[PDB]
Nucleic acid binder design. Structure first.
Ligand SMILES: [Zn+2]
Lengths: 189, 94
DNA sequence: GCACAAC
RNA sequence: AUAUCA
DNA sequence: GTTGTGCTATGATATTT
């Protein structure tokens, strides 16, 4: 936005949220009137409503960085439900199910962090380190259980969670010199 | 109420279903078949420390109620259980 | 948990 | 979602 | 005869993931 009347290069404008207006601080011209509360709007996606009574709660938050954009609900039991139709509609989801399956290597990272007592911020860095280096030609053919063992120390080394390489050698697995070279070809990327 | 749950109830919850076993019985063709095994996993005494905290830099130390309220931590203590893993085997009852 | 509406 | 207000 | 299907006071305010 830039005031149509004034036009000074550093466009000094204020967001008078309380009056729901966007004003030019110099001439006072209102540049916009429709203005939305982003906090409360975000409350509609990530709420505390797990029961299902909130009429405001109408969407859900996702993580486009880690799981791409895979929107998908799950057939489950409701109040008035026969245990028959749940099974059929779930047995029908089985026929509809390669790299769209290597996302189960996130389940390998998640089950490793929880076995290593690691926080929720470390898993999401280990999952982003693994997604951006598992199909690299720079890693080529490294021990596939030692490149995800190296991306956990990459996620810990940014989230400030102290984990020695010998601490991850105890988890899995690690071949020392094998997951030490792999911890460097990724570090360049 | 809570004390009764920690001193008694907790142990009995660890001991009701408790032990779980997995049996691997062979095809009885010939070696390396004809080997029937049963593995055990058992849960004994349950321990419970004084409240502690696991900081980001590995170090674990005691945690008082005031530090919990200020650093928004949880005033929890560690649950430890004695585990035992037995192994058994038979050929093609004992 | 109503109370009335259709199978 | 709880608590609450007349 | 049984099942099955709508709804069940007005507004307000304060936290908790
Ligand atoms: Zn202006």
């Amino acid at each position: 936005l830039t005031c149509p009347e004034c036009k000074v290069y550093p466009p000094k404008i204020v967001e008078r949220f309380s009056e729901g207006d966007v004003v030019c601080a110099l001439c006072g011209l209102v540049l916009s009137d429709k203005l939305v509360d982003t906090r409360s709007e975000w409350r509609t996606f990530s709420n505390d409503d797990h029961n299902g009574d909130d009429p405001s709660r109408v969407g859900e938050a996702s993580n486009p960085l880690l799981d791409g954009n895979n929107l998908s609900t799950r057939i489950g039991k409701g109040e008035t439900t026969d245990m028959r139709f749940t099974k059929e509609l779930n047995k029908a989801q089985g026929k509809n199910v390669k790299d769209n399956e290597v996302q189960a290597a996130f389940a390998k990272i998640t089950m490793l962090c929880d076995a290593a007592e690691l926080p929720k911020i470390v898993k999401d860095c280990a999952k982003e380190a693994y997604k951006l280096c598992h199909d690299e030609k720079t890693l080529k053919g490294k021990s596939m259980e030692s490149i995800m063992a190296a991306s956990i120390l990459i996620g810990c080394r940014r989230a400030e969670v102290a984990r020695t390489f010998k601490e991850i050698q105890s988890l899995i697995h690690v071949k020392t010199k094998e997951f030490g070279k792999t911890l460097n070809i990724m570090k360049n990327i | 109420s809570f004390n009764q749950f920690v001193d008694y109830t907790l142990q009995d919850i660890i001991c009701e279903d408790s032990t779980l076993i997995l049996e691997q019985l062979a095809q009885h063709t010939t070696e390396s078949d004809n080997i029937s095994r049963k593995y055990e996993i058992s849960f004994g005494k349950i321990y419970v420390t004084k409240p502690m905290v696991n900081e980001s830099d590995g170090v674990t130390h005691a945690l008082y109620p005031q530090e919990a309220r200020l650093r928004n931590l949880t005033y929890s203590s560690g649950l430890f259980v004695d585990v035992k893993k037995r192994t058994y085997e038979a050929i093609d009852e004992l």
